[PDB]
Amino acid sequence: DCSPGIWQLDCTHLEGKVILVAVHVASGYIEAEVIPAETGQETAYFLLKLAGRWPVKTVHTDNGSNFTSTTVKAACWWAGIKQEFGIPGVIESMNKELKKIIGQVRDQAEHLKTAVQMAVFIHNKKRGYSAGERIVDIIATDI
Amino acid sequence: DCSPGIWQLDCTHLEGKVILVAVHVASGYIEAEVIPAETGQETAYFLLKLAGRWPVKTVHTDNGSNFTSTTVKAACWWAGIKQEFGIPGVIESMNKELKKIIGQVRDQAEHLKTAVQMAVFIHNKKRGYSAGERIVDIIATDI
């Protein structure tokens, strides 16, 4: 996509922990958190944080059951987020490449949490612009 | 200030919990997390997350002992962050106004964590531009 309000949100599993990964579809920019387990409460909290930072209009996920809880729907309601039903390619590219980077830095960090954020940093800063540069430009332009 | 790489980071206490608050000085944009207690490990983690999202050059704090730990210095080292020694006004305005907003929404949220992120959202979206709009514009412009 190119629409600036669209995000993808998914969980991946690593070392018995859960990594919640948000991707800004238009730029490739990522934010991540390591959580104990997949719960509606954790997803809701993450969504509220994201919406306070970026103009989040719609969110897509590869696992629709992720968004069925009361708690998630309440967070979407309050923040004015809708579910994206307009995406039936480069999003599976982010989550596998993110896991590669995590693997690369894993030894230089003590805790998995740190390695994840190191990987996010590397991903977003890599340039011919970076994902970090692209998201800011897209959101700035859009008014 | 107006320099786009400068952030202020401080902890405030509420309901026996700790709120870590980052302010982008030039825009007034805020990010926050609720943590169990003030530790170097939590500060380091927060800094790494922030640096992966924004071009963080320097960080100031009202409590310098906050940044003395090995773990914090290692996070600053890896992310290429320096301590800001160039600030000897509107930053104490954010942390007290943030507490006001938190108080306003506190009953509409179950957990303090949620109320904090609700307050962050309100603060950043309030317009004549919002803090959220200003940070993106400043970072976009700056190249």
Residue numbers in the entry:
A (entry chain A), B (entry chain A): 55 to 142, 149 to 187, 193 to 208
Question: Can you provide the manuscript's text about this entry?
Answer:
To assist our comparison of these complexes, we determined structures for unliganded CCDF185K and CCDF185K -BI-224436 forms at 1.9 Å and 2.1 Å resolution, respectively. The CCD construct used contains the solubility-enhancing substitution F185K and exists as a dimer in solution. CCDF185K was concentrated to 8 mg/mL in 20 mM HEPES•NaOH pH 7.5, 300 mM NaCl, and fresh 1 mM DTT and crystallized using hanging drop vapor diffusion in a 1:1 drop mixture with a reservoir solution containing 7% PEG 8000, 0.2 M ammonium sulfate, 0.1 M sodium cacodylate, pH 6.5, 5 mM manganese chloride, 5 mM magnesium chloride, and 5 mM DTT as previous. To prepare complexes with BI-224436, the apo crystals were harvested and soaked with 2.5 mM BI-224436 for three days at 4°C. Apo or soaked crystals were transferred to 30% ethylene glycol in mother liquor and subsequently flash-frozen in liquid nitrogen. In these reference structures, Trp-131 adopts a rotamer where the plane of the indole lies perpendicular to the long axis of the α3 helix. B. Superposition of the Cα-traces of apo CCDF185K (salmon) with CCDF185K•BI-224436 (blue). The two chains with an RMSD of 0.3 Å over matching atoms, with only slight discrepancies in backbone atoms observed across the α4 region (residues 138–155).
HIV integrase (IN) inserts viral DNA into the host genome and is the target of the strand transfer inhibitors (STIs), a class of small molecules currently in clinical use. Retroviral IN proteins consist of three well-defined structural domains: an N-terminal domain (NTD, residues 1–50), a catalytic core domain (CCD, residues 50–212), and C-terminal domain (CTD, residues 213–288). The CCD adopts an RNase H superfamily fold and contains a D,D-35-E motif that binds Mg2+ or Mn2+ ions, which mediate DNA cleaving and joining events. ALLINIs promote IN aggregation by stabilizing an interaction between the catalytic core domain (CCD) and carboxy-terminal domain (CTD) that undermines viral particle formation in late replication.
